[PDB]
Amino acid sequence: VNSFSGYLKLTDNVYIKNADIVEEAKKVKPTVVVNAANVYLKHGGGVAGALNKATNNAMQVESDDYIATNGPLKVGGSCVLSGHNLAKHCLHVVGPNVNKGEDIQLLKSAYENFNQHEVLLAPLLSAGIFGADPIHSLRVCVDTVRTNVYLAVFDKNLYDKLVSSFL
Numbered sequence: 001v002n003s004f005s006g007y008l009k010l011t012d013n014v015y016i017k018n019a020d021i022v023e024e025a026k027k028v029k030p031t032v033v034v035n036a037a038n039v040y041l042k043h044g045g046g047v048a049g050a051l052n053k054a055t056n057n058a059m060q061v062e063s064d065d066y067i068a069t070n071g072p073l074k075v076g077g078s079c080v081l082s083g084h085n086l087a088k089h090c091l092h093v094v095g096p097n098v099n100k101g102e103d104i105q106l107l108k109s110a111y112e113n114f115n116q117h118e119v120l121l122a123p124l125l126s127a128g129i130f131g132a133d134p135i136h137s138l139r140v141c142v143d144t145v146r147t148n149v150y151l152a153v154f155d156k157n158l159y160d161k162l163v164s165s166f167l
């Protein structure tokens with residue numbers, strides 16, 4: 001039993017809700033919140049910009065030190081950093097950005113990072129400003145993640161479409 005509330009159950013392990021991931025994280029304080037990161041951990045917009053703003057830019061400060069030490073992530077890769085005031089940990093995961101020409105096949109590799117964590121609050125990878133089809137992202141999530149994932153979808157219209165079209 002966990003503290004997530006109001007989710008629709010899609011499969012044995014995947015749950016979905018129309019919610020602002022920032023507000024959901026502040027309420028649940030999950031062990032792991034997933035950020036829709038880029039390889040530079042520059043949290044400018046989309047989910048990343050919103051999560052970073054909610055930390056009063058502390059996420060960005062921590063991230064800049066991480067990059068100065070380690071260099072950029074790989075597309076499809078991840079790193080674990082602090083969750084600040086939102087969660088115990090933040091798993092920064094880099095899905096391919098279609099608006100940069102990156103290979104959508106890397107979306108499965110990106111979701112594989114979730115399997116290192118028993119329970120996660122997460123957005124749909126590569127959705128929103130990353131330019132992929134969110135219906136496809138949900139399919140890859142369900143077919144790749146085996147741990148318990150609670151998906152927050154900000155847009156109510158998109159949420160209804162994701163549910164109604166789910167196979």
Ligand SMILES: O=C1CC[C@H](Nc2ncnc3[nH]c4cc(F)ccc4c23)C(=O)N1
Binds near residue numbers: 019046047128130154
């Ligand atoms: O760009 C996108 C849009 C679709 C989906 N985004 C989100 N998912 C969940 N909660 C969210 N809260 C936000 C707060 C913001 F200010 C901006 C974006 C989001 C957002 C995604 O995957 N990427």
